[PDB]
Amino acid sequence: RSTDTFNYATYHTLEEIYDFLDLLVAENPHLVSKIQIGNTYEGRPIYVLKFSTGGSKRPAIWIDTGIHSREWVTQASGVWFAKKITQDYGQDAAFTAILDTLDIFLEIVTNPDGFAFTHSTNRMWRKTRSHTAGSLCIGVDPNRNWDAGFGLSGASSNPCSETYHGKFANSEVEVKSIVDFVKDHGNIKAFISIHSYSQLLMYPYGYKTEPVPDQDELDQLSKAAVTALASLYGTKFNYGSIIKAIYQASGSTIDWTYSQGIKYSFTFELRDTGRYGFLLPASQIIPTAKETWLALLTIMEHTLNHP
Amino acid sequence: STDTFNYATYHTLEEIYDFLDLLVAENPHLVSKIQIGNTYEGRPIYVLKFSTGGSKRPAIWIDTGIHSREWVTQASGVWFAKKITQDYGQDAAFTAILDTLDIFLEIVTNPDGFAFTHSTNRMWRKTRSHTAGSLCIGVDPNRNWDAGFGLSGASSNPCSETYHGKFANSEVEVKSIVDFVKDHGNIKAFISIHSYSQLLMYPYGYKTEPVPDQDELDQLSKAAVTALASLYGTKFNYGSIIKAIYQASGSTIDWTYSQGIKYSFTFELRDTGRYGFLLPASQIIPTAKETWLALLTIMEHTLNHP
Ligand SMILES: CC(=O)N[C@@H](CC(C)C)C(=O)N[C@@H](C)P(=O)(O)C[C@@H](CCc1ccccc1)C(=O)O
Ligand SMILES: CC(=O)N[C@@H](CC(C)C)C(=O)N[C@@H](C)P(=O)(O)C[C@@H](CCc1ccccc1)C(=O)O
Numbered sequence A: 001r002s003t004d005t006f007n008y009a010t011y012h013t014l015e016e017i018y019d020f021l022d023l024l025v026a027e028n029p030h031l032v033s034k035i036q037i038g039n040t041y042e043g044r045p046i047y048v049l050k051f052s053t054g055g056s057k058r059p060a061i062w063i064d065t066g067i068h069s070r071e072w073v074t075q076a077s078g079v080w081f082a083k084k085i086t087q088d089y090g091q092d093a094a095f096t097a098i099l100d101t102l103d104i105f106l107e108i109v110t111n112p113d114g115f116a117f118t119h120s121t122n123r124m125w126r127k128t129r130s131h132t133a134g135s136l137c138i139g140v141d142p143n144r145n146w147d148a149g150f151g152l153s154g155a156s157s158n159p160c161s162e163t164y165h166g167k168f169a170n171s172e173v174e175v176k177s178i179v180d181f182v183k184d185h186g187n188i189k190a191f192i193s194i195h196s197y198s199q200l201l202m203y204p205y206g207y208k209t210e211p212v213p214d215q216d217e218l219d220q221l222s223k224a225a226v227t228a229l230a231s232l233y234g235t236k237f238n239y240g241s242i243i244k245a246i247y248q249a250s251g252s253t254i255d256w257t258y259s260q261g262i263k264y265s266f267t268f269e270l271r272d273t274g275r276y277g278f279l280l281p282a283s284q285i286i287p288t289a290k291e292t293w294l295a296l297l298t299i300m301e302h303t304l305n306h307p
Numbered sequence B: 001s002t003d004t005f006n007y008a009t010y011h012t013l014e015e016i017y018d019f020l021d022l023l024v025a026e027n028p029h030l031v032s033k034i035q036i037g038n039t040y041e042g043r044p045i046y047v048l049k050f051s052t053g054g055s056k057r058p059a060i061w062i063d064t065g066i067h068s069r070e071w072v073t074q075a076s077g078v079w080f081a082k083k084i085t086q087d088y089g090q091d092a093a094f095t096a097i098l099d100t101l102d103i104f105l106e107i108v109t110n111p112d113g114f115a116f117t118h119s120t121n122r123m124w125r126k127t128r129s130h131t132a133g134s135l136c137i138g139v140d141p142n143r144n145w146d147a148g149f150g151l152s153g154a155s156s157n158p159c160s161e162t163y164h165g166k167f168a169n170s171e172v173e174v175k176s177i178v179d180f181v182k183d184h185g186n187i188k189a190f191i192s193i194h195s196y197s198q199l200l201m202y203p204y205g206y207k208t209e210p211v212p213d214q215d216e217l218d219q220l221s222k223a224a225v226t227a228l229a230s231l232y233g234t235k236f237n238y239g240s241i242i243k244a245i246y247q248a249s250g251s252t253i254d255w256t257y258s259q260g261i262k263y264s265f266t267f268e269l270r271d272t273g274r275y276g277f278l279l280p281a282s283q284i285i286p287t288a289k290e291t292w293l294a295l296l297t298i299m300e301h302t303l304n305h306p
């Protein structure tokens, strides 16, 4: 296989996505690199792709998919995104402008133990796979484990719950690896965490109703990103703060990244709105990724022009 | 034919409905089929009446499959029904139950959703009703009841999994049961079966205030989970809904208990999340058998406390 002969309209295994990363690197040795940022609870490597046309820790966009493993359209879109970047660079003028200044980091399998578990045992696995003493239940909600209103209303203390927060913030190696990488990088200007489903583009906060100081700008960017998105197939996304647009969620990702000074902190909930939910047909992979790419571009151009 | 029916696999809606008919034809002096309504999508809603005679005798209500993706429940409901016909007149304790109490078993309590889980989305939870002014479809039938309806523990968001609907009993699937219970007026036990989590719970889900019958219901719970655990060692916890899982408003047994049905319980069957809703078919029969034993405890106790 090469990245040109790879099937992007199909859901893949952990081993397949991991081999895809290696093909991407070998085919673009002056564009793409693969960074290991940790290992999972179970010992699997956690890998981030860096797309860079030079410099030393340029201002950057971070994008992660697959934090909740069952959300398959997200890792699939993540693969598509990688190949879109390499095809489009040096070819598309607008996108070439983005990558002549910014680096892009892309974490395709952000919850690898879960992902592997969605394949071997339970298609609907959400959480990490860390053990919990005195419980018949396994794993922690990676989207409740960040140090931002951690433990507060909007997560569960019950190990059996889908939204169990863990013993303390960053207890999950899968979250702390991202935290460590982000803090050490120091130059991340936008952070985008990709989930499915509901067709939402959101900004902070999810833990409290109080609006973020950059609300007008973030909301205005949100409206243009979903307008761009809708232009392709008419797909309707709603937007707003996590708490107003879906529900309260504590110790969630963009609440943390935003309080770290990363202004352009966003989360997408992709297709659909419930018909298939997480079980989205493979035939909707590429449409999903393509329309979401239009939204990502909107946000990345904004980031480019607003230091 | 109900002897040759495969209890160790998951069936479509048509297969369950055909099973209802075969069991009635094999046992017409014991089992009758009652239509209590039609779903939002116009499909008949059926309840099995198991009875040895009389008129509106004291009764046990059992439903499965109100959350349609909870496949082990419908599949155990099918087994329960065969089980009743197998033991009536051969097992001395169950004979005594049915000699005094009627039993109603609603196996597919959410037929639209169940059909959807087979045709389109294995993880469909809600009804299939359309929502005025929304793209999203369906109401959580376990939030649509007239007990603390619309209060903390349900969502006003149509796209939510726990969307409560416009008003209490807006879902025909819930109103059919309401109408049935009120009309009957002599249901002494009501047991709603769900999965998963391995829990046995009693009211309330809508508030922390304990029910005046908590002491008795907790002891019965203790007994039922021990009976359950006796076969395979499967560990159930128990308590009020709000303490054993989380707050949930307009939920089923809250309303039943408010109508004066003292023995209102809910089960969450196997497992604890390894497979969740996607429990292997090989576990259907062991789930049904263990669960029957706890059902038996609740049923005997109901019989002995007229
Ligand atoms: C639909 C379902 O069965 N469960 C829900 C969770 C349940 C508590 C209602 C789910 O998986 N929902 C997914 C659509 P989700 O992706 O997991 C939604 C996010 C909340 C929004 C968010 C996203 C990203 C960053 C911060 C906040 C969540 O509950 O974590
Ligand atoms: C755990 C999960 O993946 N999803 C939850 C939804 C929740 C996180 C919003 C679920 O489907 N849970 C099922 C086990 P459930 O079966 O639907 C749990 C009941 C609990 C309360 C209850 C049960 C039965 C009778 C009365 C009250 C519920 O939320 O309705």
Ligand SMILES: [Zn+2]
Pocket: A067, A068, A071, A195, A196
């Ligand atoms: Zn998610």
Ligand SMILES: [Zn+2]
Pocket: B067, B070, B142, B194, B195
């Ligand atoms: Zn349920």
